[model samples]
Target chain A: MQNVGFIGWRGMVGSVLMQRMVEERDFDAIRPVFFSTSQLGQAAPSFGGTTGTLQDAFDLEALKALDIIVTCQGGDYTNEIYPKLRESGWQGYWIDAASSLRMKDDAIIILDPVNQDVITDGLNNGIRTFVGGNCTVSLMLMSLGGLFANDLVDWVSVATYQAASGGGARHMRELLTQMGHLYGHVADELATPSSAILDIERKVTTLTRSGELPVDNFGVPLAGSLIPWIDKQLDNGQSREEWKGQAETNKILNTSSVIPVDGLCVRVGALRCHSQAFTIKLKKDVSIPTVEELLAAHNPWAKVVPNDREITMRELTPAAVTGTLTTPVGRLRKLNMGPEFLSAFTVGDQLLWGAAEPLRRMLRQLA
Target chain B: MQNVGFIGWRGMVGSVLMQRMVEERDFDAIRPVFFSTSQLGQAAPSFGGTTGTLQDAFDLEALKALDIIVTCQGGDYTNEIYPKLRESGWQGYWIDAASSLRMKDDAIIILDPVNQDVITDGLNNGIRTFVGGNCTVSLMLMSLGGLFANDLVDWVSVATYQAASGGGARHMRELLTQMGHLYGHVADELATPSSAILDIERKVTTLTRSGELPVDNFGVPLAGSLIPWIDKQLDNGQSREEWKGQAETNKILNTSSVIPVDGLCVRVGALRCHSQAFTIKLKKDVSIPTVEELLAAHNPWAKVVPNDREITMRELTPAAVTGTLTTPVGRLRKLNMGPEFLSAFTVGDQLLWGAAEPLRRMLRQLA
Candidate 1:
């Protein structure tokens, strides 16, 4: 049996990936090992019929012994591991869900349905690493891949309504804690409070109790507000998160032409869904029905739900698709710039396509 | 004193204008007459030390007698009134808030401070009609006037986060009422009901309830969710509200070259503020301080609030600036395009600069 290992297994994305791998029986062909910086030496949480001790330390030589290694361990850790893994003669495949290796020439950024041929070609070409694209870009490209395959896209303008989970476990904790605080829960004992404060008392409290708490984790109040800024500020006034669409699209599409993807990426208080409204300029005219049909038939990984199809009045809401891998698109139509230009809105669970499942699936494919 | 008359003075924007005029004593130098389509012969709301009376119906000859007529009536009313007012020997100055006269070759679209000189010149040249630009365009141009004056603006991409109030008073009423229902309030009562349910047990029991219910009129739940679509849908898949920016900007700026203002206008749950994230491309580079100085000194009607300057965080929120004329800009910076581009987020009272104040001020100026 091939030995497969994962780092950052206790992290939000890691845990999600772990759960999916076990639930889906994604790696029944192999026995898995788990590694976590935080839970070093502890038995790996049961995942895919495998429970083993964590890889005690960052050992490239020992890591090279595994047939496949998956990492949801974020950008910094990926950067540290990439060079070391290459130097250690790790001919085995490395699947990374971090931006660090995504832009590298030798690494294949895998979105199975969108770039399956390229992924297969990379594997055949002895490409040893695979990286997942950004959450917003992945969500958009899954929809756009269908649109682009049908016609040439000129420009895209998008407003991303991102959920707190895109920021990881800390963000999830912050959102829940903020919700608790909004309902008047005490700070230090939030996890195991003796009494639960009712939501009605929060409105009646006159002493301004909510004002005393400091929001250190997410850096913004995660309840009852929308934050327009996302990611750290970059030198060029655009956030790093904002630049991901441009950077990843060029790589995935392999287009030499400039693709203008200008947008405002905002973080709303939702827990898991990353939603976007896009106005696209296309290179050729196509009917709205044709575009809808293209999107519907394009990707197995994504579903194009018609605007009139009411699964729920709040079909596009984060609360509706928190733990699923499904990508949903609605409100697709032709613009006035001939039938060529089109517009649409999309929503998906960022943790699924954006982080966990891509990493796990890429590794399983490599194995 | 100059005699001024208002058409459609009881409409939403007109009512707000009347309120502000009363509060600010804006028309102290003029005796203003209020005209209504159906409410004629009634006492107009008291405004600015003058108790306006609903005048005799819209007679072109009577309208011609005024030094200036201010109109807050909509498109259909203006379309009917425009040719008649122009042909009725009403050579006196006409200030309109309707779109019908706004796009005309002879009429001027005004944003008082931004196009003040143009209005003054029009008055000098015996120009009879002055119309306020569309609300979104008026807000954008007013905010960008000083910046554009100092340098040539090539293009602008804007995402407008509009409020329900932009739709009309009915939308506001509907949204608030829906919210009350979602929160489980009694239908007939004006306030939030005492309980989520009417005491079904009490109806069968000896108890009876009395007094006015707390719910006050808004009809929909708008406290948490956002309605992405606004206004009527257009043939090109864009909303009428989305197309207003480019059309109104061209008329207001009076530039031979069309100012490209691409926009995504979305309606949110806020009561009145319209927030926008704008990316502007300029012809040349300028330092941050220079841009700041230009906005601060040139736009007397606007206030610049940098992100770093924390006078009061509460002051920056929509709740604080919704009723005020203040236009706040934060997170201003040079774009990566070699000083040719700059970005900033702007927020203002959509009901004020957007709807009410411009016509009120324009009429005052024309008088």
Candidate 2:
């Protein structure tokens, strides 16, 4: 059995990947080595029954002895340590979940349908490193690849309705805290004379004194409102989250010409799931059923559940598809822009394909 | 006093506008005339202590007598009827809320701070028709004008989280029906066996289904899911909703130089409130406080509540902001994209600014 090591094994992505590995019985074929910066020297946490000793820092020789290494160490940590690991000769596959390695020319960005061929070709070419695309991109690509594979995509536009989880553990915490604050306010309102009067007057006063509500986990308050911009803004007037779609799609498809992907990535107060609404202009006219069939048939890694059986790509929603690896596509129909365009909607777990699981699976396949 | 007539008076936008007019005491100087296609001859519904008779349809000759004709009519009605009224010499201010009249170059697309000057100039140019921008565009411009007036904006990227209200009455009914279905599913889940084995099996089986889940008001199931695409796809590989932002912004700003606006307009499960996340690349550098100050100073229409201020923007959530006329902007900050870029989030009542109120106010002003 090959030994697999994970740095930052107690964080959100780490916990999720650990859970998936144990549940999938993936650990049976591999011995686990867990390292944690925060919980160094602690007993390896049991996430679906995968257990190992925790180490404080990178042990290059020990890590190299393992057949594969995965890091969910986050952006800052990954930026600081990933290059060092590469210089230290950890020749085994390095599956990085952080964005630090994703845009690199040599590191393969893995999304089965979007870049399955590229990943396979990279593996065959003796590529030893793999990076997962941003969660929004990963989620969008999984949902989009089926359409792109069967049709000629002229241009794609997407609005990402992302949850707190997309911002990691701190955002999730902020969502919950905001929810609590709102709930507390609700209780106060209900205790007042009339609900209508309370509702009307509630706006006159601040909910909390500081105006900066205590957002413990996420750096921003996320309760009861939507945050439009995600990640940082790029010089091109696109966000890092928005730009990821274009860059990652180019890498994944290995297209002779890059598909234009304009994205509006927003952070909402939800705890999980990244939802996207997209419109695609195809090179030729195609029936909705044909489009649906193409999506459902081509992407085995994603489940294309249409809105209606007769309509195919009918409509897909997030609340229903959360927690599953399934990528639901629906509302597929011919565009009113003549017969040459198709439109669809999709929702998926950002943490799954977008974060940890895809890279983990890619590493497993490589080993 | 000027006579203001509204066709489709009982419709969503009309009703909301009427309610606001009563609240603001806006039309104290005007005697409002109500008309409805279906409710003709019925007793006019009383709102905010104001009631009037409903006419079947406006008589072209009689409509010409009115100093202002404000329409909240359906698109087909606007397309079919407005031309006859215009031809009949109804020379009073023709304020159209429907898109049919909006696309015309002669029709002024109104967003006070952004287009008020042009609208004033149009009066001298014999531009009798003034049309409100799309709901999302209006909602966005209300916020953006404040931001843009302070600096020259090079690009705007927006993600709209729209409600069922954007689709009109039927969409609202659909959401209610869908919610009924979701509640049924929730009840079914609660009644099921509590064991993990049964729950797992149930979840798996549920995942296999390819039908709609009831969660949204659009009659189609939207619970727990987001419908990404809104409106039909246009020829430019953009949804009509996406294109509206650019088209309407250019018209409102009265700039022939097309203001680059990349948008992802999505219909979420919310009942009301159109929320937008926007990033603007300016021609100059500015801090968060300066941006806030600029917005507060330029557009008195918007309240620039900072993230740290009491009654912050998050407090202006969908449920809270839906019925109000206020457009709330918060989470204002300097983007890492040098000092030239600023990003913020905003939410507003789509029914108010996006639909009825702007045209209503325009008609009042014109008269």
Candidate 3:
């Protein structure tokens, strides 16, 4: 069995990765060694059987001994330790769930279902660094891989309805806290079936404007309202999250020429599922049924939902897709602009394919 | 003074119109006669003066006596009685807040600030039916009137984060009811500071999927999730709400040739304010400062918020714009597609500008 090391197995994405690995029994094929920034020499979490004690995450000697090191420790940790590990002449595989090294020339973005051939080529070519793509990009590809695979996309524009969990675990709690505050203020009115809704809305809106709700984590009230911008604002006026759409998608596909992708990235009141409304300018006109068939056949997880009111109401939503691996693409049709212009809405679990699933699968491949 | 008959005065949009009328002292300029579908020969609502008892909204003899009749009585009433009154040879101006008469050849979609000239031209040409535009269309024009006024826009793609209030009074109550249920399920877990987030999320997600939440009005959970489609699904793959983006906008602008407009309209978890994320293709490459100046100078209500993180976080949200008449357009910047490709976000109170404000203003104009 390969000696695989785990770092940052306790945070939001890391915790999700841990649960997924445990579910998939990825540990059975590897000798798992846990590492922590603190708690050195502590008893490791028993993965069916004890493997070793917790090792120092910053200790290069401990990390270099492993055949593969998997980290969800975020970008700051990667920036500090990755260069030093390479300078120490370590030839171990490094799989990261952080954006720090995602754009590097030598690193490959691992979304096996969509880009397995690219991953295989990278492995055969001695590429040691593997990083998960951005949550929005990863989810978009997961839902619409067939479009790009068929070389049908000329340009893409997305308007993202991202969740609070994309910020971190703290943001999720803060959003819930905000929601509770908004709900609490109008609980009495809500209890009565015929209470004037505008009056209740007035009270809720007053509380939302006041210093009552928790806005510490999100910097705004995301429970009843939405924030139009996400991640860092770039110099070119694109949010860093929005800028990643074109850069990361092209990089992951290993496209010779960049395909234009641009639009707004917004944070909504959702918990974990990130839904995107896409406007795609296709290379040629395609029928809606052909588009739906191609999308559904792309991946096992990507299901095509009918554009009917009842089906879309039932299957295509954040509430339906959250905590599940299913990525549903619905509201699929040609826009009024032309038959070649397409509109699609897709929902995916941000913590699953967006963050954790790819890192665990890469470890399985290496093991 | 114009004898104005107020129909549908007690409904959601009608209530908003009533409030705005009283606030603007619009009732004092006209002899306001209250009408009801149910009540007849009853004590009327005092509009600072007793005009008359309640009259039948469907009675042509009573309706023909008024110089103007303003109705938010919805489409069913309009479809039933408008033709009857017109065939009786009544030469009165018909101001409606319903969609049935909005797209008709002789009816003009009214948004005074954006299209006061159009309204004036129509009035001079004896256009009797003046109807308010669609909620999303009116709100979008209220925020981005400058771009259209300058003829700088070639096309626009919008993804809407619409509020529950846009659906109706019952939908708003149901949304609140659904929200309370979601919060109540995880109240204890959310109250504890150190509780497991994923555990709480799982509980909330489970409840969201179950039959516990109120879905009678909205058809699904919209408290923690979003509905991608809104209104009736058209044969052309566009929702009636989405179809209005082009149809109502061109009619409101009275463009000789239609400027292409299309995108997805999504219902989000908001109270009354609707936020739209716009991807605009300008006719030519205009400077950002020039665009901002033109937008700000177009109307008193359309304020151009700077594209700064702190300002956008504070001033450009539904929480900030709800219940206010100001339509703040922000997140204004050029996209990576090119300088002519611009991304902007705008927030407005759906009931105010979107539903009632225009109807009230058109009444004020007639009086």
Candidate 4:
């Protein structure tokens, strides 16, 4: 068993990772040494009830002593100290949750379930470090891996309805707070047969005009409304969130020709799961039964809802799918745009499959 | 001035039509005789000092004395009695708010500003009956009339964020009630670094599982969610709402070849305005500045917002646009899909521009 030092274990993503690890009983395979940079002198109840104060994370001598380092802190921490550890000829394994070295020549995006051959090959050839991609991209591939695994898709267009938790823990709080303000401010005026509700809507207008809703990390009010834009704007008129869908899918698939995946990433008012509606143009048209059979047969984790009606009208939404490990896909059908044009809706817990599961599973593989 | 009998003037669409008519002082142009169905003893306070009990709409012998009849009482009423009234050969004019006569070769869909030439030509050529199109389609054309009017658009794709009021006043009340239940159930749980918000989302899921939310004409929950499909299903894997975008756009534009317009109409939680995000591919590549210039030139009613970020997101949303006549379009840019592909975001009050404005405008022209 390897000795693993944990960084950012108290952070949101890191917290999810540890919770999942406990759920899976993964501590049976490895030994964990709790360390901290920010939480010095804080009592940590980790490592099988061995409660102790957090160790100094900045001590390079102590860090190099461990066999592996699991990090979810962010790219800034990785950039500053990862290179220093490497230059010191440290032999510890590095598994990151940041996007810093994800697309680099040496770094591999590890999704062992979908593309284990590539991951095994990289590990055999002296690549000891791995990274996880963005949350939405990771969750999408988790649900739709079957079609891409068989190399049946030619191009894809996706529209995402992402939750607030995908932004961070604080972002979720901000959304709920804004929801409280917008709905509570107009509570007494609520009525049906609409003039009353419409009056409340106008009152919200005045509230907005006065800039009443809170917008911290999002830069705008995101409570009752949607933001069509996400991440930074690229030169191609695609936001950085949109660009990651195609680029990361190719890296994980390890394909020479980049699969064409265009996307519009929108943030909505749900809590945790990220839901995506996709239109995939296949290389050839197939029967509906064949497609459904393929999706169910390909992954045990992918749950397919056969009815088209159940997916609409708040039936299969982020609110229902949050905190669940299953990636659900529904409302699959062919559009009239082309014979090969198939449309689908999929939802997955972004905290699990999107952010933390890959790291947890990678640790399992190493252990 | 023609004498006109107004039917269903107390209902939602009829009320909006009358409200706009009053705002325009349009009662000066025509002599109106207020009539009603299903409202026998109700004293409807109408058009400046015209207060009286509603007349029986079933009295066809009395209706024959009028110069024109305007109806919004829905399709069943039209099917049961309207054609019979027409068959009796007592027609001075018939204008309908229902979709029963919209597609007939003899009937014209009215858009006074966008397709005035088509409407005028049809009227002179013995087309007396007119009907309004669907709400989302009408409001979309109102904001983006430039490309269609200038004959520059080749194909279009749209995604809608519709309001609760589109389903009527009762639906608006139901949505607000759902919001109240959801936010109130989790009132004290609001905080930063949100595990509390996540708990609330799960609590909402539990509420949904127990069927606590109300579902009326919508047939499902609509509070913190979206419905991807709208209107009736047409067996082509497209909703009736989806089909209308292309078919009615062709009919309104009076195009022989039918410009390909496809759409996904989603119903969201906003109260009154129907918002649409459009990607229009022009016949020829045009500069962004020229595209903006043409849209501003096409109609005096459309209000153009230049910068992508300036539309006060929370400020200029459905809530603010609900009670107004303005149709606002923003976030105009060329996309990577093609050199001809330009994208834009638009919003207009669904009641004023979407449902009732065309009928009111048509009445003014006739009067």
Q: In DockQ, how does model 1 score against the reference complex?
A: 0.07
Please compute DockQ, using alpha carbons, for every candidate against the native two-chain complex. 0.07, 0.13, 0.73, 0.38
Kindly indicate the candidate among 1 and 3 with the higher lDDT: 3
Chain B TM-scores, listed for every candidate in order, come to 0.83, 0.88, 0.98, 0.94
Interface CA RMSD, all predictions: 10.2, 8.3, 1.2, 3.2
Better of 3 and 4 by lDDT: 3
TM-score of 2: 0.66
lDDT of 3 by residue, A114-225 (tens): 9999999999999999999999999999999999999899989889999989998889988877877888888898888778777888999999989888898878888889
In order, the Cα lDDT scores of the candidates are 0.65, 0.66, 0.90, 0.75
Candidate order by lDDT, decreasing, is: 3, 4, 2, 1
Share of true Cα-Cα contacts across chains kept by each model: 0.03, 0.11, 0.68, 0.22
Q: Who wins the lDDT comparison? A: 3
- Could you give the DockQ of candidate 3? 0.73
Model 3 scores a TM of 0.97
Q: What is the lDDT of residue B129 in candidate 1?
A: 82
Q: Please tell me the TM-score of chain A for candidate 4.
A: 0.95
Cα lDDT, model 1, residue A142? 79
Docking class of 2: incorrect
Q: For candidate 3, lDDT tens digit of each residue in B1-367?
A: 8888989998888888888888888887788888999988897888856556899887889899999999999999999999999999999999998999998999999999999999999999999999998889998998899999999999898899999998888888777777778887888988888888889899999999988887888888999899988989888888888999999999999999988899999999998999998989899999999999999998998889888777788889999999999999998888767789888999999999998989888887888
For candidate 1, the per-residue lDDT at B160 reads 70
**Alpha-carbon shift of residue B17 in model 3 (angstroms):** 1.0
- What ranges in model 2 sit over 4 Å off? A45-52, A147-151, A183-212, A216-221, A281-289, A305-315, A334-341, B3-28, B31-160, B164-225, B228-265, B269-272, B275-348
What digit string (tens of lDDT, one per residue) describes model 4 on residues A170-284? 7876776776777677777763333544456667756754667778777776655677677766666567887888888899998878787765677776677687777677989
